[PDB]
């Protein structure tokens, strides 16, 4: 019962003592780390956004085709929370058409993006899905086509529904796409209810169904803002199925999420949000409706 109320104690001996960086920078170095020999072929480099930032082999992603199967993505998939995640960078401009190769390939439901669309700068993202109903894009090296269909604008965030095609076998899917709109790269959301909403509303679409393919997230690199996502979600996971929520280490996750992608959560304050979300997350789920 009071068994939150010694977790948010404990949040908040954290927060007097100011030991939240201390706590990030021993996750962080115990971190595990293995190659990504096929990442850093030469002839991948134009599909990298980041120079320091690649997907291990063991958990890329495969495209299925051609001559290059590589994207920059990483499948994590967590044992005991049940759920499997695609964590992918912001597409860039060449490689938009295997970035929803891959979303199709993958049977993927739902796209998750927590960053902005940005032409200018060092942290940016292409415009990879059309902004018009009336403007559809066609990815001629993939062979797709992709359509706006519906757009819902809140202030937090925006939630499309696109319509994706194989324009060989003409076939079509629904992909549901969930923009969480302010949220800074290395920052953290607006709020944790605004976060927990945004989650919510992803979950309940059913996007994240073992019936489909893993939901695609990506941010600008695919690891910071991402990362605190995820984690958020497997850690709310764990304290329902488990027989005790203060069993959950936040810690344990976050390392065990990391042997898939390389430097999931980015900053102390992401790490500490994340666990402020889960607490409150947990306090509603597991709370009276
Ligand atoms: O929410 P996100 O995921 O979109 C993010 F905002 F957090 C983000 C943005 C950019 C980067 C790449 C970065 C810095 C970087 C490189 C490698 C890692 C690591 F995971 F491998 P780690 O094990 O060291 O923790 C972490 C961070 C970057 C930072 C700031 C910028 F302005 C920028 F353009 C690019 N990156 N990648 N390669 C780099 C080479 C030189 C400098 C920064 C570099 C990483 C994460």
Redesign the pocket.
């Known amino acids: 019962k009071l068994e939150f109320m010694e977790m948010e104690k404990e949040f908040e001996q954290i927060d007097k003592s100011g030991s939240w960086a201390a706590i990030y920078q021993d996750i962080?170095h115990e971190?595990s780390?293995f190659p990504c020999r096929v990442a850093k072929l030469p002839k991948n480099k134009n599909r990298n956004?980041?120079?320091?930032?690649?997907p291990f082999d063991h958990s890329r992603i495969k495209l299925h085709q051609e001559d290059n199967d590589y994207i920059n993505a990483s499948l994590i998939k967590m044992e005991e929370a049940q759920r499997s995640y695609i964590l992918t960078?912001?597409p860039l401009p060449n490689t938009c058409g295997h970035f929803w190769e891959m979303v199709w390939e993958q049977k993927s439901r739902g796209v998750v993006m927590?960053?902005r669309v940005m032409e200018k700068?060092?942290?940016?993202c292409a415009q990879y899905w059309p902004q018009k109903e009336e403007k559809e894009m066609i990815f001629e090296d993939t062979n797709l086509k992709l359509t706006l269909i519906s757009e819902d604008i809140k202030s937090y965030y925006t939630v499309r529904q696109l319509e994706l095609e194989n324009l060989t076998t003409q076939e079509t899917r629904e992909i549901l796409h969930f923009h969480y709109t302010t949220?800074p790269?290395?920052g953290v959301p607006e709020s944790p209810a605004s976060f927990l909403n945004f989650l919510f509303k992803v979950r309940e679409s059913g996007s994240l169904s073992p019936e489909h393919g893993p939901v695609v997230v990506?941010?600008?690199?695919?690891?910071?803002?991402?990362?605190?996502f995820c984690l958020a979600d497997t850690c709310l996971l764990l304290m329902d199925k488990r027989k005790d929520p203060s069993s959950v280490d936040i810690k344990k996750v976050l390392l065990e999420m990391r042997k898939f992608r390389?430097?999931?959560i980015?900053?102390a304050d992401?790490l500490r949000f994340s666990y402020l979300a889960v607490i409150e997350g947990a306090k509603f789920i597991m709370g009276d409706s």
């Open positions: 962080r971190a780390d956004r980041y120079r320091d930032v690649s960078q912001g927590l960053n700068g060092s942290l940016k949220w790269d290395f990506h941010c600008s690199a695919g690891i910071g803002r991402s990362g605190t390389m430097g999931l980015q900053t992401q």
